């Protein structure tokens, strides 16, 4: 109703409410909202899609800033991070011996299809990438270090390891610890039946 009285509890508290029209664009701009610091980034595109254009490229930058805040560090994205882990874990198999050279090597060899098929989807394919991956990756340097004496990273819009070591197209540390368990899961999952039967 339009006869209803109005009180000040709906009033915003900030330095100034000032209306700024720039780039043919006016917004109600609440300057330094006092209860909590706030910020809003007005894009400027050449056209509307340009704002969407720049926006999705932010999303790489966006989540990866957020995701490393979720859990610290990362992996190098793509199967390059596991491409070194394979012979790490096949040696981690090898000294174990017996069954423990078998399963532990079976697990590490199975890692390696992802990056190729990643590069395959980018048409940088397989023999090229395994040439790229664990030729860089070494037992001489097994170390994550903080740095590269091997490039264990894989950037994918590409299919190939690249030079961007802040790149948000490498995955964080989060899903990695998860997905491997889930990768171990779908395998161990089907083990489970005991005896066998047919309902008939």
């Amino acid at each position: 109703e339009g006869e209803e009285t109005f009180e000040a509890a709906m009033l915003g508290q900030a330095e100034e409410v000032v209306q700024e029209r720039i780039c043919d664009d006016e917004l109600i701009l609440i300057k330094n909202t006092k209860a909590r610091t706030s910020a809003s980034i007005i894009l400027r595109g050449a056209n509307d899609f340009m704002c969407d254009e720049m926006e999705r490229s932010l999303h790489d930058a966006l989540c990866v800033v957020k995701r490393v805040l979720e859990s610290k560090s990362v992996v190098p994205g793509g199967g390059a991070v596991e491409a070194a882990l394979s012979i790490y874990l096949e040696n981690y198999a090898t000294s174990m011996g017996s069954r423990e050279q078998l399963a532990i090597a079976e697990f590490a060899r199975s890692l390696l299809v992802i990056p190729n098929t990643l590069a395959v989807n980018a048409a940088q394919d397989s023999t090229d990438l395994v040439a790229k991956l664990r030729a860089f990756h070494n037992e001489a340097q097994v170390n994550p270090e903080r740095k590269n004496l091997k490039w264990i990273g894989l950037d994918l819009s590409n299919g190939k390891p690249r030079d961007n070591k802040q790149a948000g197209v490498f995955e964080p540390t989060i899903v990695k610890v998860k997905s491997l368990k889930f990768a171990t899961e779908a395998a161990i999952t089907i083990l489970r039946i005991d005896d066998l039967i047919k309902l008939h």
Binding site: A122, A123, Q124, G159
Partner: protein, 129 residues
């Protein structure tokens, strides 16, 4: 369920449906035209220079025969014309590009040649427009 589909077979049927739809329509194109005459399963004949009129009124198929009318209709509404161009253009690019290039065995560089060809096309057009 156990199922997977392999490589060229769809791509072929794509190129197949791509060029075939382009054939009569591109000959129906131009100052010297042709006609695309459908014969209905009922016996009625349908003769139209627009295969979009022909194909929608006849069997529409899961391959690009499904994807040609969508982009024709996409070409139908916006400017209002080019209706016959896209299917003769899309059937034109895909065939000559893919096979030789899939004989060179790669999807990706093929994808880029479009955007490559897009600007020069924009270029020499906007220039020589």
């Amino acid at each position: 369920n156990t199922k997977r589909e392999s490589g060229r077979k769809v791509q072929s049927g794509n190129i197949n449906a791509a060029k075939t739809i382009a054939d009569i329509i591109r000959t129906c194109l131009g100052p010297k035209s042709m006609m695309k005459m459908l014969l209905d399963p009922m016996g009625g004949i349908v003769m139209t220079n627009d295969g979009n009129a022909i194909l929608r009124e006849i069997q529409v198929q899961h391959p690009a025969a499904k994807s040609m009318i969508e982009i024709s209709r996409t070409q139908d509404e916006e400017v209002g014309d080019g209706t016959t161009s896209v299917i003769i253009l899309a059937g034109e690019m895909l065939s000559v590009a893919e096979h030789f290039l899939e004989q060179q065995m790669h999807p990706t560089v093929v994808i880029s040649a479009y955007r490559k060809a897009l600007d020069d096309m924009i270029s020499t057009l906007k220039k020589i427009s």
